């Protein structure tokens, strides 16, 4: 009762301004994504040139998938951390996450920085079409 009446005084809201981040934050997120995509390209080139060597207990396919997943997840986490650094004290996404009332830092990060990898059955989006995920992509594209 008493906290709901004080909330009548102070008030609470969620708006678009909460989702917006600084221009520097957006630039850093973009740079992290570019670096991650470049690293994934390098890993793919290593695999194509047969330089890659299987991790114990894993096939070359499995170890390549694990390396690419690790790169993409680390980039996703770094973009999320940048977005969360951007948040102000007044930010209401941050307010709800800090109180624990609703939401998570994952949600804040997806809202502000990067939605992340879409995975089905524990693997990246499968090659449903013949040797490709969608008709718009070229065959044998393992890029992000």
């Amino acid at each position: 009762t008493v906290i709901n009446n004080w909330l009548l005084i102070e008030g609470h809201t969620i708006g678009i301004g909460d989702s917006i981040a600084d221009s520097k934050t957006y630039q850093d997120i973009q740079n992290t994504i570019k670096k991650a995509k470049q690293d994934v390209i390098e890993v793919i080139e290593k695999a194509h040139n047969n330089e890659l060597e299987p991790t114990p207990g894993n096939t070359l396919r499995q170890t390549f998938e694990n390396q690419v997943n690790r790169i993409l997840n680390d980039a996703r986490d770094k973009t999320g951390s940048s977005a969360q650094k951007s948040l102000s004290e007044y930010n209401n996404f941050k307010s709800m996450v800090v109180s624990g009332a609703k939401g998570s830092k994952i949600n804040i990060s997806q809202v502000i920085a990067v939605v992340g990898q879409q995975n089905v059955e524990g693997k990246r989006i499968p090659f449903g079409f013949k040797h490709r995920t969608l008709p718009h992509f070229i065959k044998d594209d393992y890029g992000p």
Binding site: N69, N73, Q118
Partner: peptide, 8 residues
């Protein structure tokens, strides 16, 4: 929808 370690 996040990653392989998260949720779909």
């Amino acid at each position: 929808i996040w990653g392989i370690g998260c949720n779909p």
